[PDB]
Design an enzyme around this catalytic site. Structure first.
Site, PDB file in Angstrom:
ATOM      1  N   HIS A  79      49.165  10.905 -52.287  1.00 30.50           N
ATOM      2  CA  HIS A  79      50.099  11.259 -51.112  1.00 30.50           C
ATOM      3  C   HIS A  79      51.582  11.182 -51.941  1.00 30.50           C
ATOM      4  O   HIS A  79      52.366  12.054 -51.380  1.00 30.50           O
ATOM      5  CB  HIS A  79      49.907  10.369 -49.815  1.00 30.50           C
ATOM      6  N   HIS A 234      45.509  17.950 -44.230  1.00 29.29           N
ATOM      7  CA  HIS A 234      45.570  16.681 -45.266  1.00 29.29           C
ATOM      8  C   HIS A 234      44.740  16.891 -46.620  1.00 29.29           C
ATOM      9  O   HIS A 234      45.114  16.432 -47.569  1.00 29.29           O
ATOM     10  CB  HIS A 234      44.911  15.464 -44.525  1.00 29.29           C
ATOM     11  N   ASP A 238      46.195  16.213 -50.031  1.00 32.64           N
ATOM     12  CA  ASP A 238      45.792  15.521 -51.153  1.00 32.64           C
ATOM     13  C   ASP A 238      45.435  16.675 -52.752  1.00 32.64           C
ATOM     14  O   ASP A 238      45.567  15.880 -53.566  1.00 32.64           O
ATOM     15  CB  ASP A 238      44.149  15.092 -50.979  1.00 32.64           C
ATOM     16  N   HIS A 261      38.640  13.937 -54.868  1.00 34.58           N
ATOM     17  CA  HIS A 261      39.242  13.499 -56.158  1.00 34.58           C
ATOM     18  C   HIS A 261      38.455  13.838 -57.364  1.00 34.58           C
ATOM     19  O   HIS A 261      39.156  14.277 -58.329  1.00 34.58           O
ATOM     20  CB  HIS A 261      39.903  12.094 -55.911  1.00 34.58           C
TER      21      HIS A 261
HETATM   22  C1  LIG Z   1      35.112  10.883 -44.583  1.00 34.17           C
HETATM   23  C2  LIG Z   1      35.910  10.705 -46.036  1.00 34.17           C
HETATM   24  C3  LIG Z   1      34.644  10.209 -46.954  1.00 34.17           C
HETATM   25  C4  LIG Z   1      36.528  11.808 -46.393  1.00 34.17           C
HETATM   26  O1  LIG Z   1      35.998  12.850 -46.846  1.00 34.17           O
HETATM   27  N1  LIG Z   1      37.973  11.700 -46.317  1.00 34.17           N
HETATM   28  C5  LIG Z   1      38.713  12.955 -47.008  1.00 34.17           C
HETATM   29  C6  LIG Z   1      40.083  12.366 -46.712  1.00 34.17           C
HETATM   30  N2  LIG Z   1      40.451  11.639 -48.030  1.00 34.17           N
HETATM   31  C7  LIG Z   1      41.835  10.993 -48.148  1.00 34.17           C
HETATM   32  O2  LIG Z   1      42.976  11.293 -47.351  1.00 34.17           O
HETATM   33  C8  LIG Z   1      42.331  10.763 -49.571  1.00 34.17           C
HETATM   34  C9  LIG Z   1      41.707   9.368 -49.868  1.00 34.17           C
HETATM   35  C10 LIG Z   1      42.368   8.282 -49.364  1.00 34.17           C
HETATM   36  F1  LIG Z   1      41.854   8.063 -47.945  1.00 34.17           F
HETATM   37  C11 LIG Z   1      43.876   8.902 -49.216  1.00 34.17           C
HETATM   38  N3  LIG Z   1      43.660  10.134 -49.548  1.00 34.17           N
HETATM   39  C12 LIG Z   1      40.116  11.433 -45.580  1.00 34.17           C
HETATM   40  C13 LIG Z   1      38.734  10.655 -45.660  1.00 34.17           C
HETATM   41  C14 LIG Z   1      38.859   9.389 -46.510  1.00 34.17           C
HETATM   42  O3  LIG Z   1      38.432   9.279 -47.676  1.00 34.17           O
HETATM   43  N4  LIG Z   1      39.098   8.429 -45.490  1.00 34.17           N
HETATM   44  C15 LIG Z   1      39.411   7.315 -46.136  1.00 34.17           C
HETATM   45  C16 LIG Z   1      39.827   6.096 -45.123  1.00 34.17           C
HETATM   46  C17 LIG Z   1      38.906   5.116 -44.718  1.00 34.17           C
HETATM   47  C18 LIG Z   1      39.175   4.210 -43.740  1.00 34.17           C
HETATM   48  C19 LIG Z   1      40.333   4.453 -43.076  1.00 34.17           C
HETATM   49  C20 LIG Z   1      40.435   3.462 -41.820  1.00 34.17           C
HETATM   50  C21 LIG Z   1      40.743   2.745 -40.868  1.00 34.17           C
HETATM   51  C22 LIG Z   1      40.585   1.810 -39.967  1.00 34.17           C
HETATM   52  C23 LIG Z   1      41.239   2.088 -38.899  1.00 34.17           C
HETATM   53  C24 LIG Z   1      41.556   1.073 -37.678  1.00 34.17           C
HETATM   54  C25 LIG Z   1      40.897  -0.197 -37.783  1.00 34.17           C
HETATM   55  C26 LIG Z   1      40.230  -0.672 -38.829  1.00 34.17           C
HETATM   56  C27 LIG Z   1      40.149   0.339 -39.938  1.00 34.17           C
HETATM   57  C28 LIG Z   1      41.363   5.520 -43.157  1.00 34.17           C
HETATM   58  C29 LIG Z   1      41.053   6.274 -44.515  1.00 34.17           C
HETATM   59 ZN   LIG Z   2      44.796  11.455 -48.626  1.00 35.66          ZN
END
Ligand SMILES: CC(C)C(=O)N1C[C@H](NC(=O)[C@@H]2C[C@H](F)CN2)C[C@@H]1C(=O)NCc1ccc(C#Cc2ccccc2)cc1
Ligand SMILES: [Zn+2]
Length: 296
Positions: A79, A234, A238, A261
């Site tokens: 980010h 988003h 990334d 990634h």
């Molecule tokens: C579905 C998942 C495999 C996917 O394909 N992607 C693609 C995107 N990746 C990014 O945005 C990257 C990796 C990093 F998230 C920053 N840059 C977004 C999501 C991803 O990894 N989310 C990571 C992520 C995991 C968890 C919570 C919570 C939370 C939480 C919320 C409330 C209470 C308790 C916990 C946010 C986020």
């Molecule tokens: Zn991200």
């Protein structure tokens, strides 16, 4: 008339929490000399450990983009690098008091605001660009990532989530404002995955303040989405951060098809290795260049 390298005019200070670690982290961005690039620095260690933000230093790829030098790492750089890429910052030291960059609101928005508040300084040296000269594609199963020659900078992305809440977007920075249309797009997570991720000490810093949280059927965030296509926007954010691991701004097109990634880093490594596919260019006259930058 030349397009000049840019650094920070003034230092940036931020405090936040790591998305995965949940650790409190102090961030300082400092000006850096011509041809330094972006260099991360663990200032909690003695001696201090410095890791150039370059594809050669990428370790872990699962959770986020991690830089590694021996047993030291800097987690979740993508980010902040997206913010530096979007604003055309060439040279900067990024000092961190812990292993993970602060998540802030889950987007590049807070970094872009802090940087543009500090202001940018043009430096007396030609900005270097990586120009794509040949098509380079990597695939793994159903995922694909491609560089295509293009006299400008554009990014296409497609995801496919079999989820009721959920998916294709294209940005060309000849028209698209990085700041207005991409930088505010937040990371997202599925509520079904959070208990499991916590058990693997991931998402420890996650909250509705720094992530779109998706249940079975709805975004749970009270205020909802910033963009109708926030999720794929988003992924573009990334992708721009991961591309900046080339260490220079791109003249070319990126296309992502369920990439992340891991496959983005495989694409950078394949491009860097194929020296027939790219060249370093400068623009001694901004008026004839295929890209332009905001006033500093
Ligand atoms: C579905 C998942 C495999 C996917 O394909 N992607 C693609 C995107 N990746 C990014 O945005 C990257 C990796 C990093 F998230 C920053 N840059 C977004 C999501 C991803 O990894 N989310 C990571 C992520 C995991 C968890 C919570 C919570 C939370 C939480 C919320 C409330 C209470 C308790 C916990 C946010 C986020
Ligand atoms: Zn991200």
């Amino acid at each position: 008339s030349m397009i000049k390298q840019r650094t920070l005019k003034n230092i940036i200070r931020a405090t936040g929490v790591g998305l995965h670690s949940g650790e409190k982290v102090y961030l300082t961005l400092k000006p850096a000399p011509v041809d330094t690039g972006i260099v991360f620095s663990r200032t909690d260690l003695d001696p201090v450990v410095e890791i150039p933000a370059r594809a050669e230093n990428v370790g872990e790829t699962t959770m986020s983009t991690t830089l590694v030098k021996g047993d030291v790492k800097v987690d979740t750089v993508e980010h902040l690098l997206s913010a530096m890429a979007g604003l055309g910052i060439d040279n900067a030291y990024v000092e961190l008091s812990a292993s993970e960059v602060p998540i802030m609101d889950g987007s590049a928005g807070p970094f872009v605001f802090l940087i543009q508040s500090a202001g940018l300084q043009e430096q007396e040296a030609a900005k270097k660009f990586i120009r794509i000269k040949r098509e380079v594609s990597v695939e793994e199963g159903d995922k694909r990532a491609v560089f295509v020659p293009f006299d400008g900078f554009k990014v296409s992305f497609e995801i496919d989530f079999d989820h009721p809440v959920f998916q294709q977007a294209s940005v060309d920075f000849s028209s698209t404002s990085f700041v207005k249309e991409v930088s505010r797009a937040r990371t997202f997570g599925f509520m079904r995955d959070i208990e499991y991720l916590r058990s693997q000490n991931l998402a420890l810093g996650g909250s509705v303040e720094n992530a779109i949280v998706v249940d079975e059927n709805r975004v749970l965030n009270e205020d909802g989405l910033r963009y109708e296509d926030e999720f794929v926007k988003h992924k573009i954010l990334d992708a721009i951060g991961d591309l900046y691991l080339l260490g220079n701004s791109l003249i070319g097109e990126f296309r992502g098809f369920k990439s992340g990634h891991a496959l983005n880093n495989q694409l950078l490594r394949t491009l860097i290795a194929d020296k027939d596919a790219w060249e370093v260019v400068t623009f001694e006259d901004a008026r004839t260049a295929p890209i332009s930058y905001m006033r500093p």
